[PDB]
A paper describes a structure:
AsLPMO10B carries the canonical fibronectin-like/immunoglobulin-like β-sandwich core structure found in other LPMOs, consisting of seven β-strands arranged as two juxtaposing β-sheets. The β-sandwich supports the histidine brace catalytic motif (His26, His136) and the putative co-substrate coordinating amino acid (Glu206), which shows conformational heterogeneity and was modeled in two alternative conformations. Copper shows an incomplete square planar coordination, hinting at the presence of Cu (I) at the metal-binding site. The latter is likely a consequence of the well-documented photoreduction of Cu (II) during X-ray data collection. We also observe electron density “above” the copper site, where the putative ligand would bind, which may represent a citrate molecule from the buffer. Tma12 has been proven to shield its host from predators by exerting an entomotoxic activity. Their structural superposition reveals a possible site for AsLMPO10B O-linked glycosylation at Thr166, matching the N-linked glycosylation of Tma12 at Asn158.
These copper-dependent, redox enzymes cleave chitin chains by an oxidative reaction and synergize with chitinases in chitin degradation reactions. Can it be that the two LPMOs have different functions? Both A. salmonicida LPMOs cleave chitin chains by oxidation and contribute to chitin catabolism. In conclusion, we have shown that the LPMOs of A. salmonicida may be moonlighting enzymes that not only contribute to chitin catabolism, but also play a role in the pathogenicity of the bacterium in the invasive phase of CWV in Atlantic salmon.
Residue numbers in the entry: 26 to 217
The structure:
Amino acid sequence: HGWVEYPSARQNTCYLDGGFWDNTIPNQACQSAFDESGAFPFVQRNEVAANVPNYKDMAHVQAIVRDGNLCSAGDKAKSGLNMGSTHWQKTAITLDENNQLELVFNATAPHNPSYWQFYLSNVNYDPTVPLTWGDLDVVDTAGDIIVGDDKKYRIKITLPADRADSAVLYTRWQREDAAGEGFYNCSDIAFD
Ligand SMILES: [Cu+2]
């Protein structure tokens, strides 16, 4: 259980902006998600999750987390997260001298053994259309990472230095257990 804290996952930004209990939501993409799903996806910021027992087989992953449902990890109760918008708030990204950023994943329930896959929407992706697997390229992977003493995972990832547009970073954190729990988060970013 957890979420991408930096660059903040979509549902985490919605949550931390607040307003959804008293009709003061500040952002119009956050409002539209709320209109479709209510507060559930925001208060459940740490369980954007799907179980894939055959987790090493991407054909099995894509049968469970289906095109147009990646940001909700296939949960219809979180479907508002998947809506296309020009107004999703973006984290401005400047890569370090090695073309990296430190991704920070805040875990309420650390899980090991596990592994990580990082995907990036391609330059032809239209943010007004829900994300599909065909929109994504794998940019980096990680193995079993020990959680910090502050219950955050820190992972240096390499991103392309040729990008200057807005994109979705798609983080997959996969447990290596019988049930095959995995956590799927979309992070809206603006390369600058
Ligand atoms: Cu968990």
